[model samples]
Target chain A: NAMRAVIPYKKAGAKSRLSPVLSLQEREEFVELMLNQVISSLKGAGIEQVDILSPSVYGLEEMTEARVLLDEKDLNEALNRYLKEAEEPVLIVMADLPLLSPEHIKEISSTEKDVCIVPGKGGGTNALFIKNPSKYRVKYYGSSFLTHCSIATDSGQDFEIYDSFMAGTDIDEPEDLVELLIHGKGAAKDYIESKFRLEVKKGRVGLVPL
Target chain B: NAMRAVIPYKKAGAKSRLSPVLSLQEREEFVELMLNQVISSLKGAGIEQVDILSPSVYGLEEMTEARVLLDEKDLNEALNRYLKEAEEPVLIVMADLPLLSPEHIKEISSTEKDVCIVPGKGGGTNALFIKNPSKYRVKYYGSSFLTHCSIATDSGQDFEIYDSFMAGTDIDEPEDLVELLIHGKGAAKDYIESKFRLEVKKGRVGLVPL
Candidate 1:
């Protein structure tokens, strides 16, 4: 069975939490770099059709082959509406996850359950694979991983949590940049490496911008 | 802050799922081997007090230095009672997790949240580190990972999910034996290696009885 991937992205004011180290222009460029990595990983996992679900399109069409579906609604509402109309199995992945690989994508896609939730750190949903999109809805924000689990149970759907450290790590903080430097590959890691150098103090690794 | 380790065990009919490959006596011996690994790892993580909470003590006294607390009640009731009467921080771990190491124990123990849940595969709670046991209770069996998450939320307590592949793996089935052989060390892996040999067919590895 073929699977379609939908990535939720914001064009304007993206990755503001990373502004402590990254400038406005740098954050926007870095967001695109990670989004491209996510797209490439999805296609590498044998996903033919990928959709970029966003509020507006800004150089997104030139970035990747994914179809940019414009929706001017909030995350949950826009993603839920997309899921309601999805014909094939839909995988909703956060665009900021630069560390995601094709193996992680394949693992989530190959699950036998109706829903597979890849939880982010501090109670967030990073990637959600819904085999039957009509049976599940997107519940983003504030402990949404637990909320999605409850939704799966209340609807009597078989769901599994795909516990992967790489998939769960999303780049939202300056400290998160350290993981991308250590474990990440491709253009995203290269971009961060060009901008930041690793700093080791008391056996802990930190990032120092160039 | 001193944290105590509690491992719940059942002496009678332990690991009935492995009966197809192992005899009753072999299963019992394997259970103790894994229990000893867990106790040793907990001690290595600098946990001063370790308690083996079981219904009865059968040769458990000779197993390790951990104080075996006998409780006739069921898992949830008995654990909740123990949590309520606890004086310090408590870390409850399932005895079947032979792949657990001192680093995994330290990661869970060093969490700053009120509760840290290490979810088992298929929605079971494997290891839980409760910094404040009096503020929380134990809920085990039947998708208890989600149940514990809900309980933590309802009580308005801060909780974090400790995502680790080794810590989440609990030996229950024949196929699960492969993971122990691949990533596990200590006596548990050695015991399984004696009975089974790895067979790779069509890029998939399977276990064959020796």
Candidate 2:
């Protein structure tokens, strides 16, 4: 709900190939938005320890040059590096999903469920879950959930499919953003269960400030 | 100080980047040795949190793909993110700084210090102290400290550099590791003062390891 973006200067060997993409304000907004979602989700998942890894190498040069407190790129690299050394199963989640919630994480972790995917209307995913103890490859992305499901079946992996609000809603194109802004009120239940898509069970979702 | 590397299946669209960059059995040894160092260091430093990120991501993935027991990546990301979002000044230090004592962190914090650095023999830093209100650009990594300092100065920013162990020495590469193994036994005088490099501190360092 309240995360911010960090932008670091380009590292000598960063492979992310980010072309100094975000401006200062844009970076700040990105961090604030995405980090909040990611952190909140992880925390809700009963994860006590977490780290963030970089998409690539990051140098302090970017941070210093930004004349701001943080370099988004550097923070990303550092976090990504942390992810590399994390001790627990990792879940990469975006903060932009108003449909996503801690409940989805709980549902995924409670069982030794294998990788699961929630599809979106576009070429994005509403939710993605990867389980442990597997020889399975990443099953799918894009409009290939069926192929992914086929891989799962062939691989003899234990898995189940789930429908989640946030997992089913992703923000890729501009229209997705409009949907979120429209329904992103403080009342989660009215925005989710009653919305007619989530078909939430007896319980309704809760909405706390991020 | 106790650490276990958790490597994920994939990171930032890259093939799962494993850590300790270690070979299979090499990673075991690396974990064993590093664990010893990490645990002892935490005991010495009295750190309440010691989480593993990366290298163990694979293990965690294997353990239970369902949920994260403890996400070490989140831990790393949390701190970096916290630093990035800090509304006040923040400091960053390594766990194995030979000249560092637990008091060092407290000392710098209480001193109300401005930006500080601890320089290593050739050109490395063990710790850094910064007094930022919100997101002071990071200038630690890379050899750009001087350049950053000049830039900050040019912008009329008060950037103070400390050359003591409080901001010197970083455990990178084999030689730095040797320095720690050979000389840094008493790391800010915690334990095992009987190592070969006690005299490196002119016999002034004091640590009685069990």
Candidate 3:
């Protein structure tokens, strides 16, 4: 089925006084790295329409060549379009996945997951892929995964949640590299081992990185 | 006769998002007006400290010229210094005081007012002048003003709650200005009367300019 999957990646730390302020180089690299995975995922899902929503008023020159949704102010405009014209189901993906693989996308797609969530053990969810993406109010990040699930309940839609070994891992600090090292071996070993070239400390689960 | 006083002239929209947003223009005008009235009020009283705590950040250049205590991210830092180093009382005045008068300050000073308040019409105290300023946490511009009063109540100090027409108003909306126009007179008269120059149509209380 020819579908349109939209990934909403807001400019990080726009609201806060101290929400991980990224440099120009860091932001450019972020778009490059994240869009690479997103494009790969869109290819895996066989969806043509892919958009990265960058709401920050300044500093988004890296995504000039991409299908840039100009108005991030109106949040629902892009998502609403997909719902109206989408022939097949839409799969929205988050940008922070380091160990993302095509097989995981296939597994996620093979099932009927109306609203799939990948919760982080600390707090807040890392990844979310919605079959019926616009069926609910999806404030994708922060402490709103349960609220989003409840929204699905209200919309009278059957939503199945999926938590993968590779999906739950998100890159926030320099320390999260450890989890990808162990979990990457099971799922997307080659992609993880090659591009990132990341090394993990050898010990037990609690003792060291690996 | 000269002194320092902080004025929290926060915008109504900012209340929903930022707890405190500084307005140097509002603060400058406010402090200038206070210099005249406060000096007259404290005729012979030895004023140790007078600081204004607004809820927003301003430029260092703007703040430097005004000689104001800018409530940036480090508001508590500014407050703590005065609170620790001082041996006398501190007065906290709300910026939305459309009816504040010199008499209130004079009366409070001449009398033994340890912990006193000028209650707002909307249940919170708009003005608080305390003898032992360090004893209480100076959490300004929140719904917790009443709770702070209760803390003073439990402390068994000479806690006085005095209100006049001048002390009762906290002008949060355009309707409040109309309220002054229709019924209020005296100290708040000039602020309401000056509305004529601003193109406020009569009976246009609920409406706002685009």
Candidate 4:
């Protein structure tokens, strides 16, 4: 069976929580950098074809080769809409991970279980590996790992948790920016570090805008 | 009513997870700095008397007035032991809150609920307020906020979650060291900033020993 990967791209109002540390322009630039990294990692994991599931192709200029599944709706709705139409085994990857590597992607895909879920920081679905995306309903809300587990258990689907520091971490909040700058490497890391001067003041990390 | 606070001081193996970013000497310095900060916050909250629940009191040079509750057992057991002997309403504070403010302490103390639970980053019980300490048991392992919630609920005790960014953040990891230096402004923050230089690399934050 052919493999497929889906990335939920939010062009507008992206990383609003990170507004404390990152400006709108910086957020947009950083998002694309991280998205490119995710794409590169997925390709490294042997998924030749990837889809950008988004409301529009506005900010996705870098993802030229990937297919854009345009759906002008929210996250849950767009994912649900795509899951139904996707015929092959699908891998859903979130676009905020600057730390995600090819090794992390391959580790998740290497699992034999029909369902592999990566739990993000503060109860989110970072990535989902499923033989059939349509068979399961996507629960990507608050504390979603438990919700996904219950959903899989109730439906009798074989699910495994793909837990790793690199895969589990997602940049959503100001503190996450700290994680990114401290543990991340490559384009997104370079973009964030270049844009912000993160320093330790008293015993806390302080961000100085450059 | 007379009130007392309990801080379980991990004297020997303090901040082991943060060993990658901080050395043993730095961790010791940082731990005491945070302990002093928590003590200051609790004192600022109007709790005149507090207890340092630990096996040894070697590292408690700054906390001259606080009482010592010696316990050789691990976290859960030590807290359970202290709770049994405690006659007054107790405020259990973690020793790693570099950002804890007097306002945060007072807000938690002001709650009328029999049990007040403060959830920490990555599923920890950062602070706890108990009107009757002996009435409830302490379960401080693996997503402990949930365990504490169930324990309170099963006993039909009224409990409230005291949610605040200041009290919720704890310094258990290297990333936490970044947060302390960036967002905090007191002794703990000052100590950490003086000890380490937190910088951004690629998209990650790196801690350098100063």
| Model 1 iRMSD vs. native | 18.0
Which ten-residue region of model 1 chain B has the weakest summed lDDT?
B198-207
User: What lDDT score is found at residue B185 in candidate 1?
Assistant: 82
Give the range of the ten consecutive residues with the poorest summed lDDT in model 3 chain B: B13-22
Q: Name the docking class for model 4.
A: incorrect
Ranking by TM-score: 1, 4, 3, 2
> Which TM-score values does chain B get in all models?
0.97, 0.49, 0.60, 0.92
**Model 2 vs. true fold: TM:** 0.31
Q: What is the TM-score of chain A alone in each candidate?
A: 0.96, 0.54, 0.67, 0.92
- Model 3 scores what on Cα lDDT? 0.49
Chain B TM-score of candidate number 1: 0.97
- List model 2 lDDT by residue over B62-82, tens digit each: 432222233344434544544
Could you tell me which residue pairs clash in candidate 3?
B6-B51, B6-B52, B20-B55, B20-B56, B21-B55, B21-B56, B22-B56
Q: Using DockQ as the measure, which candidate wins?
A: 1
All candidates in order of lDDT, best leading: 1, 4, 3, 2
> Which parts of model 4 are misplaced by more than 4 Å?
B1-210
Deviation of model 2 at A158, angstroms: 3.0
lDDT of 3 by residue, B107-165 (tens): 65444656776655323456676777657655443333455577676776667755344
Of 3 and 4, the candidate ahead on lDDT is: 4
lDDT of 4 by residue, A30-115 (tens): 78888888888888777888999988778865557588888888777888888888888888899887777787777777668878
- lDDT, residue A74, candidate 2: 42
RMSD of each: 18.8, 25.4, 20.6, 17.2
